[PDB]
Amino acid sequence: LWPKQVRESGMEGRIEVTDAAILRVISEYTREAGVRGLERELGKIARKGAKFWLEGAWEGLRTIDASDIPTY
Amino acid sequence: RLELPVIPLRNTVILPHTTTPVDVGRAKSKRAVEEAMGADRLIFLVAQRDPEVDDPAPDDLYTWGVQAVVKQAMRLPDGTLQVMVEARARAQVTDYIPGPYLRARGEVFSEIFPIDEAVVRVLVEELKEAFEKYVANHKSLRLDRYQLEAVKGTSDPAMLADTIAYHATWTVAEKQEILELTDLEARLKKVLGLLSRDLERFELDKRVAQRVKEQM
Amino acid sequence: DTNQREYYLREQMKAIQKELGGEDGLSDLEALRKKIEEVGMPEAVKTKALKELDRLERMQQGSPEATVARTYLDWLTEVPWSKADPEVLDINHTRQVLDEDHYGLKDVKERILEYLAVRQLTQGLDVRNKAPILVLVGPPGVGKTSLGRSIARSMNRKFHRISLGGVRDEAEIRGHRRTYIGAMPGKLIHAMKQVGVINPVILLDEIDKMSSDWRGDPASAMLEVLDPEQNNTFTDHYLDVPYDLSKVFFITTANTLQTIPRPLLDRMEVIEIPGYTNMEKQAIARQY
Amino acid sequence: DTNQREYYLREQMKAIQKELGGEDGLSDLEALRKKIEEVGMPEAVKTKALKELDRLERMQQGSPEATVARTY
Amino acid sequence: TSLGRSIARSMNRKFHRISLGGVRDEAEIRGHRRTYIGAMPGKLIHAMKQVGVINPVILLDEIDKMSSDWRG
Amino acid sequence: DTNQREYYLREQMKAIQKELGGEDGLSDLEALRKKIEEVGMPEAVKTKALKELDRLERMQQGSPEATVARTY
Amino acid sequence: DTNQREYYLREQMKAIQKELGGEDGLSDLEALRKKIEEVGMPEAVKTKALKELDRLERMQQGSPEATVARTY
Amino acid sequence: DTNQREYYLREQMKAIQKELGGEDGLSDLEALRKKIEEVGMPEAVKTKALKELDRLERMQQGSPEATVARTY
Prior knowledge:
Lon protease (chain B), AAA, globular, 8 chains, hydrolase, mainly alpha, 2 strands, part of a larger assembly, Helicase, Ruva Protein, domain 3, two-stranded parallel ribbon, 50% helix, protease
């Protein structure tokens, strides 16, 4: 999924998404019997990332964790 | 040479080595005809297609020209001036004065005869064969072709190009270009390419005509 | 010499077609035929212009045949191909333009900033979307045309409305067979015919009140248009080669989040348009 | 006499939309004609292709036969 | 139309009134197609030509009764 | 012979149809040629009028394009 | 004399109109339009009736409700 | 003699339909007319086969009474 989502946005090499993050996502942002809700939420993360980078580059490596959730 | 009133041609194409009646009935040009025949019988001919006025304008005339020494002094100011002049050597344009009258120099009045004759008469014979096959497809668009066959002794190639180039009607303005050109081989290959596109579109017309009959 | 003969045959067809046919626009038809080579347009479009060029030469009645060919040449050379606005590369400049609209309320203007922030970050060695158009929804008076107006300012593009209230047919979406006059395309080709760029904006109006009650689904052709590559293959009933509708940005106004047709509930992103406060509306009546 | 002249000139229309149709009336007809003689297919199906072959070489404003036959 | 007559007089102009009731097409709103004689313009042009001033007053009658069947 | 008769019937239709009234008089061309210049129209209306003025004066009763231009 | 020349003309009009399939045989949608106007009714009947005249001519008469409209 | 006449129609109609839009009708009309009169059949077959022999030589598109005839 997440490689396709950094293919959607264009944050190739920009994004670190760990997997406690993915646990937080499925436990909090999608309760369905598929993969589509994960496309939607990881799309929200991808879009908010492109916003935070084009306004200014703080780093080249961006750690998304279980702690930056209601910001993306 | 010997600055003249200028006669803007838009309806008569003269020949070198042959008399041609000039038909000028426009009011500001027939005075130039009278004053040029009073200019020791010398007439300076430059055509125009830039919008047709009776003024000798430097913006309407080209940079190419032709001479005309007068062979019959007649003017008829009650209508179109009937005058027969002749060219014996073509010219160019050197001067421009806003008219009336435009004062301009041409070239000298003399006879021109070819030095080389071999490649000259080869291209003359090719052009005569081209006219005599084109005038066969010009039978529907009829023009008499005895007028070339009586002047076969004249081996002047630019004069015969002025003749055959006159004896085929594709565009009067390009015939004014050719009639006023200095260069002879350029006007010869030009008339060859014109007979080329003419006979090629004749054959395309025959193709479409048989196409139509078969569709019938 | 051959082209002299060929354009000579074109002069023959002009000489004949100014003798018969519907002729009070047939020299205009000749200009649009001349405008085929003059409007920058694709070679599939140049080839369908060769097709209608061999549907020209109407050496028959002024009955609709010449007229429908004139209209086809009109819709050719007046829906612009190959012409475009130099876009802005910035969301900072876009925010500079949205400093002036209704102040922009700082709720949805940042969402538009998101959606353009990813789309001033277009990668893939192209411009891919794989994305919605970010549809809008609210009561009608609020700044639908105004917000889209400011965004068209921001990109230095143009803004334009075409409406879809009370539409029910793909016959209203797509046109019909150009075999009689009165055949035209649907709305969208005319909306593009209004602008002179292949990168305009279109504002779709009231699309939840497009309620299909006859043959054909408009929602079918509209979800075709909403798909970011099927628009690039989208064509109507009137036309041959599909207009490249991938270079065209879109935006859409509706009012109901529930009467929207169902495949349109994908390829979509809702931003619910607000019902403004008194103080901001007052500020508008004071300042603008 | 008028409608005679009218038929005469619309024959000119068709034959000058033809323009030596060995090339074609419009040249893309013999580009899809070679998909007959260059695509390996069964004999009855290519036989009805060869029977459609004799109905080819038509324009659009004239006969709309290759209009469907190319697509076929 | 009483109000309209005294409008044109009170404007010192010319009053003219025509009907747009029942119109379905561009036959009486716009003119007919230019490919035939018997194309006559909209009634609006009629109101123009029949009256004489650059500043007329035109009255459009039964405007709630114009709809569409053909010609948009 | 019967289809040639039906042909002849449908053209006797139009021959009877053009009867019952005929247009003559050629001073109307002078009248309208004046009234274009003798009704001072703006360059929109004087331009379209000069177009119809240049279009005519070859026929205005004959060809179906110059007739509706004459009524125009 | 005017009525008599127009009588010759209308004579030959009916003479040609006769031998052309009997005025479409007075086809079905002609006579359906007739019968509403051939019976004097309240006027809103004629309104919704020519309405439902226009509501046809778009289905195939396999329609299980627009046929019910034809019955109405 | 009736069979000889149907043979002559069988021969001439396939000789002409083999050159024409009977190629789109596949010329199976006078190929399966051989099953009408050129195979030993009962008078039931001859009766029905005449009833759809009259349905030979037809148009080939738009609800064809030729293809259902040869099928019959």
